[PDB]
Amino acid sequence: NMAGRSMQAARCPTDELSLSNCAVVSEKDYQSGQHVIVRTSPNHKYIFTLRTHPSVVPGSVAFSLPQRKWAGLSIGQEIEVALYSFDKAKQCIGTMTIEIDFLQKKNIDSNPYDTDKMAAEFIQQFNNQAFSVGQQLVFSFNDKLFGLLVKDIEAMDPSILKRQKIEVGLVVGNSQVAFEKAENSSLNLIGKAKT
Secondary structure: OOOOEEEEEEEOOOHHHHHHOOEEEOOOOOOOOOEEEEEEEOOEEEEEEEEEOOOOOOOEEEEOHHHHHHHOOOOOOEEEEEEEOOOHHHHEEEEEEEEEEEOOHHHOOOOEEEHHHHHHHHHHHHOOEEEEOOOEEEEEEOOEEEEEEEEEEEEOOOOOOOOOEOOEEEEOOOOEEEEEEOOOOOOEEEOOOEO
16 A cells, blocks of 8 residues: 555445545555545646545545546546655644535525634544645535635644645644635625635
8 A cells, every 4th residue: 555556436435425525445455544645647646535434345446526526537447546644744734725615506595604613514524634725525514515625725833832835734623724705606604714
């Protein structure tokens, strides 16, 4: 796994896993929580955090539609996957800016959405996972689906006992998230976790 191995891209097994933004794998190949770099070509590499599920066939990695559309993956294609280790002294996320909008135009409404509650739920759901600038994913908040786009990521400060922009980082328990609606969005955001 450290050297990297060939795998086949598959479809995400459950709706719940689809919302986790994790790449899903067999317990026979990896352990949940590990991170990997997925290679589709010399110029295209993407970092994902893994979660196991009993239904995944060994030798394959399952991705959700949003992940497939961001990394440019096709079901059934061959990919190379290698274990990735973050340098936590430099890559833990201090602040991240995320563009948000309703995922389904059918379900758009003018009601207020509390960004402070959204930011808290975001951390509760994605802590200890990799995010890259430009990455697209879906976020379920209060039974409503939203589309997210990572616009910016800044590394965290050292602890008290002891701002750089980064392309990829690890969301941790004390990371801060700020939301901004997409241009021409009718999304009504309230609260202080904005901009």
